[PDB]
Amino acid sequence: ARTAYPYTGSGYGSAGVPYGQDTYGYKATTAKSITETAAQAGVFNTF
Amino acid sequence: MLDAFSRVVVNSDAKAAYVGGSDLQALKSFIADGNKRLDAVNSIVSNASCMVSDAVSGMICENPGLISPGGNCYTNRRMAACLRDGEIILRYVSYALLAGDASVLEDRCLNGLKETYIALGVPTNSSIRAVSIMKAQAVAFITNTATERKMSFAAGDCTSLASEVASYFDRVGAAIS
Amino acid sequence: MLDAFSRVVVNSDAKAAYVGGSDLQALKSFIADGNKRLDAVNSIVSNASCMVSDAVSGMICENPGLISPGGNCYTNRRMAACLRDGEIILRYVSYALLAGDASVLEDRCLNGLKETYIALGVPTNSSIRAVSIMKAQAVAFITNTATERKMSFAAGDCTSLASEVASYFDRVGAAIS
Amino acid sequence: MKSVITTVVSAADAAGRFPSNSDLESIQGNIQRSAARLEAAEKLAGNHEAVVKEAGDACFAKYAYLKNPGEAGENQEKINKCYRDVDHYMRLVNYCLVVGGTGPLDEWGIAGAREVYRTLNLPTSAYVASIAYTRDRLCVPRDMSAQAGVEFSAYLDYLINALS
Amino acid sequence: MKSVITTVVSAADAAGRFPSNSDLESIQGNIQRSAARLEAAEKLAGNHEAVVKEAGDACFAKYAYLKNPGEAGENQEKINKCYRDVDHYMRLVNYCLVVGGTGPLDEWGIAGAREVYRTLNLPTSAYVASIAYTRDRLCVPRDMSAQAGVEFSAYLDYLINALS
Amino acid sequence: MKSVITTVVSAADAAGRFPSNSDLESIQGNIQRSAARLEAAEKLAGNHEAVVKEAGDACFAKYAYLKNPGEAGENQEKINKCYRDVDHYMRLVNYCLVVGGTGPLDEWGIAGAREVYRTLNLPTSAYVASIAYTRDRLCVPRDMSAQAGVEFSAYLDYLINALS
Amino acid sequence: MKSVITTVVSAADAAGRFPSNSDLESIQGNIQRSAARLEAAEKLAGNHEAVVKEAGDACFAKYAYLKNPGEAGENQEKINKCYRDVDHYMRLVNYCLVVGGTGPLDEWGIAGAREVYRTLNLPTSAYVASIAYTRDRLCVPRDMSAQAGVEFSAYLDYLINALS
Amino acid sequence: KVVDRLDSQPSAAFEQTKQVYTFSRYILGPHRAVVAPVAMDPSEKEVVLRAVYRQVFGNAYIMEEERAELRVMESQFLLGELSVKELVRALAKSSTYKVRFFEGAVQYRFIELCFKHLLGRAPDNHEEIAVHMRKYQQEGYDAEIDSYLDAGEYDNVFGDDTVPFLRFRGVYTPCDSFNRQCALQGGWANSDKAMGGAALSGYNGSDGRQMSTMIGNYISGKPIPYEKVAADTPLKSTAPNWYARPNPALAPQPAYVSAKEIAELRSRVSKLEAAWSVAVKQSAAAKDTVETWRAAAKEMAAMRGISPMGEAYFGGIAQKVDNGALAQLGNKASSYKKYLYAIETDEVSRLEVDLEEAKGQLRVLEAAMAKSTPMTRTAE
Numbered sequence A: 001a002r003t004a005y006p007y008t009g010s011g012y013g014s015a016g017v018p019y020g021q022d023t024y025g026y027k028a029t030t031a032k033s034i035t036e037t038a039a040q041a042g043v044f045n046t047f
Numbered sequence B, C: 001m002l003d004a005f006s007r008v009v010v011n012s013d014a015k016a017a018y019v020g021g022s023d024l025q026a027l028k029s030f031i032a033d034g035n036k037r038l039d040a041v042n043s044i045v046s047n048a049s050c051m052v053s054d055a056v057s058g059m060i061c062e063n064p065g066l067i068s069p070g071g072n073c074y075t076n077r078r079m080a081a082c083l084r085d086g087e088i089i090l091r092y093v094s095y096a097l098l099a100g101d102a103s104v105l106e107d108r109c110l111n112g113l114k115e116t117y118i119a120l121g122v123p124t125n126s127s128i129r130a131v132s133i134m135k136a137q138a139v140a141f142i143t144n145t146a147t148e149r150k151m152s153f154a155a156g157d158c159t160s161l162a163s164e165v166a167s168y169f170d171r172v173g174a175a176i177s
Numbered sequence D, E, F, G: 001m002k003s004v005i006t007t008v009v010s011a012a013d014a015a016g017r018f019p020s021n022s023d024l025e026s027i028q029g030n031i032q033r034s035a036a037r038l039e040a041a042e043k044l045a046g047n048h049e050a051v052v053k054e055a056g057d058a059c060f061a062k063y064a065y066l067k068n069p070g071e072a073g074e075n076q077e078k079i080n081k082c083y084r085d086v087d088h089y090m091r092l093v094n095y096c097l098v099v100g101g102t103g104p105l106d107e108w109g110i111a112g113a114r115e116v117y118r119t120l121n122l123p124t125s126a127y128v129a130s131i132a133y134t135r136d137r138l139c140v141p142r143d144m145s146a147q148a149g150v151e152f153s154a155y156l157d158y159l160i161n162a163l164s
Numbered sequence H: 001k002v003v004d005r006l007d008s009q010p011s012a013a014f015e016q017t018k019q020v021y022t023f024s025r026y027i028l029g030p031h032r033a034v035v036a037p038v039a040m041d042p043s044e045k046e047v048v049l050r051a052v053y054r055q056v057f058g059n060a061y062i063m064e065e066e067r068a069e070l071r072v073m074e075s076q077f078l079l080g081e082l083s084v085k086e087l088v089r090a091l092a093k094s095s096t097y098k099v100r101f102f103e104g105a106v107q108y109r110f111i112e113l114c115f116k117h118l119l120g121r122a123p124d125n126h127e128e129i130a131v132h133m134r135k136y137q138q139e140g141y142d143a144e145i146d147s148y149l150d151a152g153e154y155d156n157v158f159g160d161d162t163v164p165f166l167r168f169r170g171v172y173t174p175c176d177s178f179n180r181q182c183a184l185q186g187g188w189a190n191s192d193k194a195m196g197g198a199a200l201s202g203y204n205g206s207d208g209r210q211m212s213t214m215i216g217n218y219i220s221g222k223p224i225p226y227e228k229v230a231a232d233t234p235l236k237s238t239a240p241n242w243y244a245r246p247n248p249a250l251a252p253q254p255a256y257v258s259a260k261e262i263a264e265l266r267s268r269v270s271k272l273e274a275a276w277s278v279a280v281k282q283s284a285a286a287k288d289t290v291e292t293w294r295a296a297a298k299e300m301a302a303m304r305g306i307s308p309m310g311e312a313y314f315g316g317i318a319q320k321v322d323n324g325a326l327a328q329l330g331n332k333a334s335s336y337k338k339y340l341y342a343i344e345t346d347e348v349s350r351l352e353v354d355l356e357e358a359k360g361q362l363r364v365l366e367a368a369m370a371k372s373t374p375m376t377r378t379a380e
């Protein structure tokens, strides 16, 4: 429509994008820890 | 560089053909409206000084991010360089329209321009818009349809030269893209 | 090139901000220990002639393969170029420490130095070691902890300028890597 | 930017020399004069919303013809962009008071100005009118100190001489 | 190719100028003279069978020694390649009548000819003999008009002067 | 002076060539167009008093602020020197109509004007106002013929574009 | 001579600029540091007979082989010319303390020394031995003040680094 | 007409430097004109000589054993007989120039090197290369050098006394010539012995093949890739050192790139250009809310306009202000400052920033996606 940068929200004053891009205000943590991320990266084995 | 006359000569030299009577109908028609071509080039070079400041200021009121701090037209030096390559492109397009062939345009102006503007960080979106506004001014000045300047001409039709210069301007735009 | 004063000016010009009283705390502290900065630069440029022959000979007494036949420091011409290289890097590091900003270092010395050595076949391992020995000499000469030359100074602390020149030397080392 | 620092180490770099005693001696004056030239910097930085206001209307009071149709200040947004230019020039003078040389002026306001002001029909006399009006309204014990006023006026007249 | 067009826009490109009134005024003569210089173009293009035939035997009639063994025209295929060269030169003169300048001659027949004719023992006098024989056999009301004959002879003698 | 003649002669001299057919062909347009461009020359030369008079007061009618004290036209001798400049520019346009090119303009009015008009505070907009007032008052069958009017207006707007 | 003055006005002359604020600011350090660097000048100038004497025998005490036949200091007049060279170098250091830069050293002792000392078999280590012996015998409150001693040692070291 | 004359033309009598040089990259870096003054200290003759050896040899070490060659021809300049152009003519015809740049070189490399040494420019097109090749092959190296110096282009630009320098003209006819000039001089820490490969190929660094790249770019009109113009270049030795909204300096290419991140970035840029090309048309038409009322409100505001000081008492109280060009119409100091945040506030301009930086991130990844077989990968 417009504002190439749409927004989140619902009700009057909305644009068609859910609140938080998925109606998730506070999202869970998906990233792993330091040694976990390193160990799955496959390149930091010696480290 | 080539012109309209030599363009058919390199086409005939590719087959070792003499330029016969078939080939000269395109060139004797180039002579018949040659006065319209000179009258069309004279209208562009008369208002060429207004055309750059017209187009670049239109490109600015398009996008205020160019005069934003850090923007590509933010400094007086950068604004002078943008007004400089507006004029260079308008100069080579008027060369190509005078010659009747686009050859001098794309080995002296557009050859190596895309990677130059990529290496400089010149934004290509506004470069397209500065050329398109100059194209719109060119068709208005050739067909004598500017809002506040009318030039004296002999009566007749001129949409062929207007379409030729419109064909040169999107060659420029596709080159810088 | 820039210095410590103009560095905050390009930072304020990025937002069209005037340089206010918040910004001048960092610069009026640059003036307070300016005499320590001149006293630190004077200690380096005094022993700069010993520093190159110190560092390059240390780099030799580690990798004999450089003076081996076919090695990169095997010829008198190649040894003179390596001693000439060292001095240029020590010169630009002392420029950057005097200016208080690393800008003159990485557009006049390190910009394009990566390919210069790669294309020449200059081994980068020994290039790292020749710079790190000069860094170790720089922290010893600034903090007045050389073994056999002590210089007269007014008493006080100088680890900030020593950490600044240590920050310039690994910029050099990460550039040539 | 041309300053006290960047002059003496490019003269040394062009000759391939280490920083000598002249190079160190030149920066000693950057210690003395920076007490005066920085005192005008926050003075201009804190009160920059009264100087642009007082210069902009003086420019149009000298030249009332600019508000005619077809001229440079015919409508409102052009006058809005005109006050923005005096704000830009005072910001560059504020920068040059901080570096200690005419670096930021020569890079960002001077180089290429004589092409854009002729191409876009901006009269340079109306540009120097506002800078001259800022120049003669310097009460030397009231605006700032004496040497800070000298350092401020010497950068204003440099821009005046460069624009004309 | 050097013509009326490519001269005035490279002089403008070297100076960085738009096409001025001299540039437009130079092409106005390309409108007047092209009625005369193009009338000789189809005249040479339609009757090029006999001019090469006429010139080739006149070349060997002036120089009968070329058919001796060890010379340039000793066998049949060398004479066949000799008539092909006069056809090439008349084709380049036909091109130069169409462009309006000495472009195609200077690119395709003149540049580098003085090396290949000395390396391959081709006598240049026998080359200019055929062109001169074409030059004096121009019946000025019968072959073409007057101006077209002037434009044709001025391109023949340019090739004569360039080959010698 | 840049003209049709000094254009082909300089283009050939630089290449070391004799005057070719393009060089002769360029001067043929100097025969056709000189009937039109010289007809405006005596028309401007004979009535050169009613044009400077009508341009000078139009300049001050657009810009009445110039007669203020401290401005460019404050006293009588400055206005006398102002009318002399429009007479100079119309004399250079009269010369360029005779030369056929923008030679005398570029040598005697254009080169170095942007320095003296900024140094002596002469506003260039007031210079181009008089030339534009001359430009729109060209009654194309009454002042001169049609093509003489085209040739006159093309030299007026060249000076307009060069001064701005 | 390279000094604080001749650096900043040749940088201005190469750019074609008037002396800016930076230029003036560089000479302000030539006012502060000249109290210290001139105090060592008369100290070296008045006691210049006890320093050459104490450096010359230290040179021969480090290198006793120079008095052997075939060496540089074999006879008496060669030792007389050897003490004259240390007097020359201390005179050039006295000059460089007065100009404020390494001008007179670089013109009169440094340029071309590496050719004459190799051609005439003068060992440069014996030259720097005397200068180093003058360098470590600087009692910083007794010979001069603190900053005058810093300025003196910084010019001695420069000659040491340039000779080796 | 913003540029009056070029730099190929001789300098006008009104200007100290050329007009093209005042707002190009000339004013920034060390590629400037070094003029020899008419009487010189023996100090300041060496300032000229060091710039000559920096330029003519094009960044060469030159030990003083290799300087005792040229001690004869420098002495005619130190006396003041040789001009600077005859000094570079004498230096080009010496043997150390020959053994470095002629005696192991292909002809393309030697021609493109003396274009960079004796003039400040790249080879322009192919036709000017061929004429110098044919100038050498029939007349020799000695007349080949005079073909460069003794023509029109040297004396109109350098005269006889400026040292040659890398010319930042601003007006390039063949365009690419700027990229060839920036790729021929490789920044401040390069040389021609290194870029020509005359040391790795050489034996103990001497007797090297002075090979050349970019001869496919001279013949076919195929212009220089962007990485040799943005990474190692005089553009960043003569940089303006300011805040650019797209930073034009390339990041170094990352190890361990995957095709998945390239696919998501290539989808991002295709969404952004489609958003830009539709946000363009709405701008300058529906840009403002108080725009229809701009013509309406002017006639309400035109009432009660007075010249002197003190009006608009509004009942009994006297105080009032007005009287100000910017103020007569209600504007404040913040009214002209809204143009100074447009990079991060204009809805159109945000898309144009993020289009260019997603492009700049994209362009380095396929340079890293040119290596396939022994290439280990990660999981981000």
Ligand SMILES: C=CC1=C(C)[C@@H](Cc2[nH]c(/C=C3N=C(/C=C4\NC(=O)[C@H](C)[C@H]4CC)C(C)=C\3CCC(=O)O)c(CCC(=O)O)c2C)NC1=O
Binding pocket: B056, B066, B072, B073, B077, B078, B079, B081, B082, B083, B084, B085, B086, B088, B089, B108, B109, B113, B116, B120, B122, B123, B126, B127, B130, H023, H024, H025, H170, H171, H172, H173, H174, H175, H178, H240
């Ligand atoms: C022969 C052909 C030829 C051209 C076409 C031009 C184009 C051109 N412009 C610039 C250089 C430039 N070009 C621009 C132009 C623009 N930036 C924008 O945002 C706008 C879209 C556009 C103006 C309308 C700017 C702003 C610079 C300066 C960049 C800088 O100073 O960092 C450069 C590099 C040299 C220099 O730094 O000046 C070149 C080759 N010049 C030529 O010689």
Ligand SMILES: C=CC1=C(C)[C@@H](Cc2[nH]c(/C=C3N=C(/C=C4\NC(=O)[C@H](C)[C@H]4CC)C(C)=C\3CCC(=O)O)c(CCC(=O)O)c2C)NC1=O
Binding pocket: B047, B050, B051, B053, B054, B055, B057, B058, B059, B060, B061, B062, B133, B136, B137, B140, B141, B145, B146, B147, B148, B149, H284
């Ligand atoms: C948002 C910012 C913005 C601007 C700065 C102007 C600029 C501008 N003008 C034109 C459109 C044009 N611009 C010109 C140029 C000129 N006209 C003249 O009479 C002079 C000779 C010369 C400048 C002195 C011409 C001739 C046209 C065609 C219509 C006409 O004016 O008659 C266009 C393209 C079509 C259009 O949008 O109208 C733009 C963007 N318009 C804008 O929307």
Ligand SMILES: C=CC1=C(C)[C@@H](Cc2[nH]c(/C=C3N=C(/C=C4\NC(=O)[C@H](C)[C@H]4CC)C(C)=C\3CCC(=O)O)c(CCC(=O)O)c2C)NC1=O
Binding pocket: B032, B033, B034, B035, B036, B038, B039, B040, B042, B142, B143, B144, B153, B154, B155, B156, B157, B158, B161, E021, E024, E025, E026, E028, F033, F147
């Ligand atoms: C040296 C400089 C020089 C020039 C500037 C031109 C000037 C010029 N233009 C035309 C003549 C003309 N010019 C036009 C062109 C137009 N008419 C319109 O209504 C359109 C707006 C515009 C289309 C682009 C037309 C239609 C004619 C008449 C047809 C023709 O002569 O071909 C003529 C022939 C009529 C005459 O004036 O005798 C001439 C000499 N020729 C020159 O030698």
Ligand SMILES: C=CC1=C(C)[C@@H](Cc2[nH]c(/C=C3N=C(/C=C4\NC(=O)[C@H](C)[C@H]4CC)C(C)=C\3CCC(=O)O)c(CCC(=O)O)c2C)NC1=O
Binding pocket: C056, C066, C072, C073, C077, C078, C079, C081, C082, C083, C084, C085, C086, C088, C089, C108, C109, C113, C116, C120, C122, C123, C126, C127, C130, H059, H060, H061, H188, H189, H190, H191, H193, H194, H199, H200, H204, H205, H206
């Ligand atoms: C402006 C910045 C600037 C620099 C940083 C230097 C660096 C530099 N060194 C060399 C050239 C060289 N550099 C070295 C240096 C070394 N080899 C080693 O094994 C050691 C690790 C190291 C010395 C400590 C050598 C040995 C050569 C000579 C290579 C050869 O002769 O083949 C070159 C190529 C030019 C030449 O051949 O002389 C450059 C640009 N020069 C500059 O102008």
Ligand SMILES: C=CC1=C(C)[C@@H](Cc2[nH]c(/C=C3N=C(/C=C4\NC(=O)[C@H](C)[C@H]4CC)C(C)=C\3CCC(=O)O)c(CCC(=O)O)c2C)NC1=O
Binding pocket: C047, C050, C051, C053, C054, C055, C057, C058, C059, C060, C061, C062, C133, C136, C137, C140, C141, C145, C146, C147, C148, C149
């Ligand atoms: C294997 C080969 C080998 C060498 C050739 C020397 C060289 C050398 N010296 C230092 C370490 C140093 N090198 C110097 C340099 C100098 N010292 C001076 O007093 C003079 C002024 C100047 C040379 C004349 C200085 C000042 C230090 C710091 C410690 C000190 O000397 O007081 C270092 C780094 C730390 C270390 O290893 O000690 C090296 C490698 N040492 C080696 O291991």
Ligand SMILES: C=CC1=C(C)[C@@H](Cc2[nH]c(/C=C3N=C(/C=C4\NC(=O)[C@H](C)[C@H]4CC)C(C)=C\3CCC(=O)O)c(CCC(=O)O)c2C)NC1=O
Binding pocket: C032, C033, C034, C035, C036, C038, C039, C040, C042, C142, C143, C144, C153, C154, C155, C156, C157, C158, C161, D021, D024, D025, D028, G033, G146, G147, G150
């Ligand atoms: C033109 C040449 C020129 C110089 C060389 C410097 C010389 C210099 N250094 C210091 C002064 C000083 N220098 C140091 C520095 C140090 N002390 C240590 O014990 C550390 C080893 C070392 C840290 C790097 C300190 C701590 C002071 C005193 C504090 C200060 O003045 O800032 C002072 C002020 C005291 C004085 O001498 O009056 C001066 C003038 N200034 C100049 O104008």
Ligand SMILES: C=CC1=C(C)[C@@H](Cc2[nH]c(/C=C3N=C(/C=C4\NC(=O)[C@H](C)[C@H]4CC)C(C)=C\3CCC(=O)O)c(CCC(=O)O)c2C)NC1=O
Binding pocket: D043, D044, D047, D050, D051, D054, D137, D138, D139, D140, D142, D143, D144
């Ligand atoms: C940053 C530096 C700085 C300055 C240069 C001044 C600048 C300055 N002072 C005044 C405002 C004023 N300035 C003065 C000063 C003087 N009036 C005179 O007639 C004398 C010549 C001179 C004192 C010797 C006075 C008396 C006022 C208040 C009344 C007036 O406008 O004159 C104004 C108008 C807006 C305002 O009221 O603030 C400005 C821009 N103030 C600053 O903060």
Ligand SMILES: C=CC1=C(C)[C@@H](Cc2[nH]c(/C=C3N=C(/C=C4\NC(=O)[C@H](C)[C@H]4CC)C(C)=C\3CCC(=O)O)c(CCC(=O)O)c2C)NC1=O
Binding pocket: B057, B060, B067, B074, B075, B076, B079, D056, D059, D066, D072, D073, D078, D079, D081, D082, D083, D085, D086, D088, D089, D108, D109, D116, D120, D122, D123, D124, D126, D127
């Ligand atoms: C960093 C330094 C810097 C500057 C100095 C200015 C300079 C400048 N001003 C304008 C643009 C303008 N500048 C003015 C200003 C004035 N007209 C007058 O009659 C007075 C002399 C003056 C007000 C007091 C006006 C009215 C315009 C609009 C002209 C137009 O849009 O064509 C433009 C074109 C782009 C734009 O609209 O911003 C530029 C680059 N901008 C900068 O970025």
Ligand SMILES: C=CC1=C(C)[C@@H](Cc2[nH]c(/C=C3N=C(/C=C4\NC(=O)[C@H](C)[C@H]4CC)C(C)=C\3CCC(=O)O)c(CCC(=O)O)c2C)NC1=O
Binding pocket: E043, E044, E047, E050, E051, E054, E137, E138, E139, E140, E142, E143, E144
């Ligand atoms: C394309 C341009 C063109 C020409 C230059 C002539 C060229 C020409 N004419 C003739 C052929 C001829 N040419 C002439 C003409 C003349 N004989 C004379 O003695 C007079 C000098 C002159 C007339 C004034 C005559 C009379 C013949 C026929 C008999 C003959 O060969 O002389 C021939 C020999 C082959 C043939 O018969 O056709 C040629 C090549 N014709 C052309 O189509």
Ligand SMILES: C=CC1=C(C)[C@@H](Cc2[nH]c(/C=C3N=C(/C=C4\NC(=O)[C@H](C)[C@H]4CC)C(C)=C\3CCC(=O)O)c(CCC(=O)O)c2C)NC1=O
Binding pocket: E056, E059, E066, E072, E073, E078, E079, E081, E082, E083, E085, E086, E088, E089, E108, E109, E116, E120, E122, E123, E124, E126, E127
């Ligand atoms: C486009 C312009 C163009 C030309 C002008 C010719 C020029 C030309 N002629 C010959 C080659 C030749 N040319 C001739 C011609 C002659 N010998 C004579 O004694 C007479 C002067 C003349 C006939 C009238 C002969 C006999 C040869 C053969 C020589 C050989 O094979 O060594 C060759 C070598 C290749 C070949 O065999 O074709 C070339 C380039 N070819 C061209 O492509």
Ligand SMILES: C=CC1=C(C)[C@@H](Cc2[nH]c(/C=C3N=C(/C=C4\NC(=O)[C@H](C)[C@H]4CC)C(C)=C\3CCC(=O)O)c(CCC(=O)O)c2C)NC1=O
Binding pocket: F043, F044, F047, F050, F051, F054, F137, F138, F139, F140, F142, F143, F144
């Ligand atoms: C050398 C070339 C040349 C010209 C350009 C004109 C120029 C010209 N005409 C007039 C004077 C005039 N000029 C006109 C002409 C016109 N009035 C109009 O409204 C129409 C637009 C146009 C006819 C189509 C008329 C009608 C007068 C007399 C009344 C008036 O001033 O308008 C004047 C004022 C002084 C005077 O009366 O002479 C001038 C300078 N005459 C020339 O000799």
Ligand SMILES: C=CC1=C(C)[C@@H](Cc2[nH]c(/C=C3N=C(/C=C4\NC(=O)[C@H](C)[C@H]4CC)C(C)=C\3CCC(=O)O)c(CCC(=O)O)c2C)NC1=O
Binding pocket: F056, F059, F066, F072, F073, F078, F079, F081, F082, F083, F085, F086, F088, F089, F108, F109, F116, F120, F122, F123, F124, F126, F127
């Ligand atoms: C050959 C070409 C040629 C010119 C174009 C003029 C240009 C010119 N004008 C003036 C000088 C002047 N020129 C003007 C003219 C004007 N002031 C204005 O406000 C208006 C724009 C305009 C009148 C319409 C004035 C008023 C002066 C006097 C300024 C002064 O004396 O400082 C001077 C200085 C010397 C002198 O007094 O003559 C010169 C060179 N002279 C020439 O020789």
Ligand SMILES: C=CC1=C(C)[C@@H](Cc2[nH]c(/C=C3N=C(/C=C4\NC(=O)[C@H](C)[C@H]4CC)C(C)=C\3CCC(=O)O)c(CCC(=O)O)c2C)NC1=O
Binding pocket: G043, G044, G047, G050, G051, G054, G137, G138, G139, G140, G142, G143, G144
């Ligand atoms: C112009 C500057 C200047 C100087 C650098 C000194 C230099 C100096 N002092 C002494 C002479 C002396 N110098 C000293 C000083 C010292 N002895 C030490 O062991 C300490 C390291 C140091 C004090 C801290 C003493 C104590 C003498 C007398 C005895 C001796 O020679 O040691 C001598 C030998 C000749 C003589 O007796 O005069 C010289 C050249 N004097 C000067 O006028």
Ligand SMILES: C=CC1=C(C)[C@@H](Cc2[nH]c(/C=C3N=C(/C=C4\NC(=O)[C@H](C)[C@H]4CC)C(C)=C\3CCC(=O)O)c(CCC(=O)O)c2C)NC1=O
Binding pocket: G056, G059, G066, G072, G073, G078, G079, G081, G082, G083, G085, G086, G088, G089, G108, G109, G116, G120, G122, G123, G124, G126, G127
């Ligand atoms: C202006 C600066 C200046 C100088 C520095 C000297 C440098 C210098 N010394 C000598 C010449 C000499 N210099 C020395 C000096 C020494 N030999 C040694 O072993 C010691 C290192 C040292 C004494 C301490 C000797 C012994 C000679 C004589 C050598 C000879 O005659 O061949 C000469 C040759 C002409 C001459 O005899 O004077 C010169 C130019 N002269 C100058 O004009």
